[PDB]
């Protein structure tokens with residue numbers, strides 16, 4: 001579950017949750033279901049904490065969203081420590097980017113969420129995939145930590 005396909009589906013499911021368009025095909029997994037609740041809570045918190053910065057920028061295109069994602073993500077992981085709360089922050093931030101793009105993207109495209117999901121899955125896989133596998137993946141690591149007791 002640390003491979004690209006699995007993480008891309010998590011990132012895509014989260015953007016569909018934010019855009020209020022869940023896919024009517026099979027329905028999100030147990031992992032996705034737990035992640036959507038935790039990531040949405042962090043997203044509301046980050047939206048409040050980053051309000052002065054977010055107002056300062058207009059997310060006019062996917063390249064702008066990528067630049068903002070890299071600047072937040074580069075500082076979130078610079079001390080080299082990886083933990084599940086930091087990984088939830090990646091999804092929370094992609095949710096903020098898709099909201100900002102929906103309102104501010106100059107040339108709207110219905111596939112924009114798939115492009116943001118791809119670069120989010122690339123970041124998670126390249127920067128944290130090794131750590132995720134060693135810590136039980138999504139099913140024996142993440143879900144065990146964040147599912148209800």
Ligand SMILES: *CCC(=O)N1CCC[C@@H]1c1ccccc1
Nearest residue numbers: 050052053054056057068071072
């Ligand atoms: C929070 C720092 C800030 O004001 N800005 C504006 C330009 C880039 C940066 C930013 C980073 C993350 C979210 C929003 C803005």
